[PDB]
């Protein structure tokens, strides 16, 4: 789906398989966070369904023994002073030592400031010992998290369930036609893109000689020249697009390890899975009721959230006992008006716009020797469309490996561009999740004092009861980063900015910052930065010291009576689109043994009316609806046709007959040497075979 999902798949520890456990046998004690998982397994990233606790992820600093036991590093301390010697310890060796905590005040020399520190004793017992017994210390606050959990800013302000959902939903984002890096990040996004391997890096140092849209030529210092090719519009395992673009000039000097070309979800070497949008937190006429989302129309007129999806279709030409199938344009069964987009070989031409029920290749089957030709042509399935971007034909006569029994192969690729619409799923990094309820014109949207409309509206009733307050902090910091700030130091550095670095005392508009996962921006710092931001073109400050702004109403014109929270937030598009979930059916294919409708969307199937849905019908008292749903719509072979004829002709619906599954059951019972018979009011078993 994207580079993060591919990287996460290769770091998974699974407790099932040929030699382990089962989803049914596993109980409730194998799905718990043991105290010995600290530094070896992530306690947050885990599935949400029946596989909760049976699948996990390796931590960032963990490594495996030559025996199979996971290790983790520590810093050795002696005489109350932290050294800089790293030793890797297994879970069986760290229970005989006292291990300190990562968030511990350390002076310049390396002595603990606090008299007592929080440690971890033998059996995972947390205690407050006086700092004079410590023997080891953590290496970093992010030692216990995985690579996808270490990408959520302000993680310590979020509940465990919401961080779990945020980590699971960061792997479902789709690549967009244009990418942009977060305004507020964590710093893990740079080495999560190089190690994933979806970028192009230089293996040696040199200058760039030639750059085009599909190749880069680098001249090395010794004399050798190396050229790198690109994958333009390639289809991934899940139908997404994998496109690489160069980000270098024609005279740049390149050092070994530098990123040369971008990738699917990459912006200048760092992973970018979404976009920055201006948010307002307020209810709006009930259109964002119960986790719905309101969008703007500027996100459709400017292609902000647009993705490319590619499809692939195949067909095979083989021999037969009556002849040999051949691919050709000549088909004596269909007209000449629908055979205008085919070439002299029976295939479509590149650049043609196909639609549902259209023709892709033309193939006929002989029936034996004329007038023996039947029609079997590959056609576009129901509800599909898009341009044709490539055709790959394999033949037997041109010395190509082919399965035995077939003569020719052909593949057709069809691509489309999808915009945002109602029913599509959006998400954030903190657990926010909902479908789009409405898309509004830009004149119907609340706007700031200078006339800037907002891009998305989120409801305030869902934040307090779910304990994910990291999103509000993210919006505050995003607004501060977007606008830019400057701290006054005329009378010395203020008291709240004592611990800030010297490069964070001033910033430019559209700046990028980084807040690590467990050591980032405090709240005094945010509160002090919210009152230092720069003005806009005119000397006005729209957002006050609380992070709230006064908005106008775009439908009535009057200002809203109270200030509303405004800011910038990072929004991703999830791979759950409504165009792939709509389905309907009146009649179609049926089964073979029990002549019920088929199942599934690809086979044009029906919807199950299960056991629990019959109890509701019986509790309502609806005796005719249930009978019709169970006989003339599922199994009554003779009544289905009469019902269709009556509906078309406008007459009354006939009386249901008897289902076929009952007869199948009776023959099943009779095949186990059971003498089951259907009697009448006076004996004289009924035949139950029709025929008269």
């Amino acid at each position: 789906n994207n580079p993060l999902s591919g990287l996460t798949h290769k770091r998974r520890l699974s407790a099932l398989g040929p030699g382990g456990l089962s989803r049914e046998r596993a109980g409730l004690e194998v799905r718990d966070v043991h105290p010995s998982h600290y530094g070896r397994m992530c306690p947050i990233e885990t599935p949400e369904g029946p596989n909760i606790g049976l699948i996990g992820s390796l931590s960032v600093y963990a490594r495996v023994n030559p025996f199979g036991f996971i290790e983790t590093p520590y810093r050795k301390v002696v005489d109350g002073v932290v050294s800089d010697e790293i030793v890797y310890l297994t879970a069986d060796e760290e229970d005989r030592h006292v291990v300190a905590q990562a968030n511990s005040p350390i002076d310049a020399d390396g002595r603990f400031v606090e008299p007592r520190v929080l440690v971890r004793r033998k059996a995972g017992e947390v205690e407050y010992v006086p700092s004079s017994e410590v023997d080891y210390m953590d290496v970093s606050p992010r030692q216990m998290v995985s690579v996808a959990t270490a990408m959520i800013p302000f993680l310590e302000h979020d509940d465990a369930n919401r961080a779990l959902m945020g980590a699971n939903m960061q792997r479902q984002a789709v690549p967009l036609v244009r990418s942009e890096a977060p305004l507020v990040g964590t710093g893990m996004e740079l080495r999560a893109a190089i190690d994933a391997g979806d970028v192009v890096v230089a293996e040696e140092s040199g200058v760039i000689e030639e750059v085009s849209a599909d190749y880069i030529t680098v001249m090395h210092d010794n004399g050798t020249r190396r050229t790198y090719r690109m994958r333009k519009f390639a289809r991934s395992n899940h139908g997404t697009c994998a496109n690489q673009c160069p980000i270098v000039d024609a005279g740049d000097r390149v050092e070994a390890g530098q990123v040369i070309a971008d990738g699917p979800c990459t912006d200048d070497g760092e992973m970018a899975l979404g976009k920055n949008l201006l948010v307002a937190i307020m209810p709006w006429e009930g259109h964002n009721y119960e986790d719905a989302i309101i969008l703007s129309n500027r996100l459709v007129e400017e292609d902000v959230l647009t993705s490319i999806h590619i499809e692939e279709h195949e067909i095979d030409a083989r021999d037969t006992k009556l002849g040999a199938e051949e691919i050709t344009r000549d088909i004596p069964n269909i007209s000449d008006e629908v055979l205008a987009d085919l070439d002299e070989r029976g295939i479509v031409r590149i650049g043609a716009e196909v639609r549902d029920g259209d023709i892709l290749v033309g193939k006929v089957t002989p029936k034996g020797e004329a007038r023996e030709v039947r029609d079997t042509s590959l056609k576009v399935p129901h509800g599909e469309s898009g341009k044709v971007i490539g055709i790959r034909v394999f033949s037997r006569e041109d010395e190509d490996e082919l399965p035995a029994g077939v003569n020719e192969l052909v593949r057709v690729y069809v691509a489309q561009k999808r915009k945002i619409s109602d029913g599509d799923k959006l998400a954030g990094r903190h657990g926010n999740k909902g479908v789009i309820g409405k898309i509004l014109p830009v004149e119907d949207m609340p706007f700031l004092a200078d006339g800037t409309p907002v891009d998305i509206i989120l409801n305030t009733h869902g934040v307090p009861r779910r304990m994910n307050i990291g999103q509000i902090l993210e919006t505050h910091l995003g607004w501060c980063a977007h606008s830019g700030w400057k701290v006054d130091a005329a009378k010395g550095v203020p008291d709240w900015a004592a611990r800030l670095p010297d490069e964070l005392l001033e910033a430019q508009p559209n700046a990028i910052v980084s807040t690590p996962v467990f050591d980032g921006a405090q709240e005094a710092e945010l509160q002090g930065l919210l009152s230092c931001t720069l003005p806009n073109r005119d000397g006005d400050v729209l957002v006050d010291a609380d992070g709230k702004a006064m908005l106008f109403d775009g439908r009535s014109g009057e200002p809203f009576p109270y200030p509303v929270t405004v800011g910038y937030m990072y929004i991703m598009k999830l791979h759950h689109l409504v165009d792939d979930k709509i389905h309907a059916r009146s009649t179609g294919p049926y089964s073979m043994i029990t002549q019920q409708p088929l199942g599934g969307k690809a086979q044009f199937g029906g919807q199950r009316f299960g056991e629990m849905e019959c109890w509701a019908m019986q509790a309502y008292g609806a005796a005719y609806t249930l009978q019709e749903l169970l006989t003339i719509k599922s199994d009554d072979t003779v009544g289905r046709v009469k019902v269709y004829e009556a509906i078309v002709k406008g007459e009354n619906i006939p009386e249901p007959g008897i289902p076929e599954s009952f007869k199948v059951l009776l023959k099943e019972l009779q095949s186990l040497c059971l003498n089951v018979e259907v009697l009448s009011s006076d004996g004289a078993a009924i035949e139950l075979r029709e025929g008269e």
């Binding site: 590093p73 890096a181 390890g257 530098q258 070497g269 980084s514 980032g520």
Partner: peptide
Amino acid sequence: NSVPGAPNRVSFAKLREPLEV
């Protein structure tokens, strides 16, 4: 940091790191 060409992303971190991932 530690990568030849990378965007300049300033950080709020107050602790130093003795190891690289």
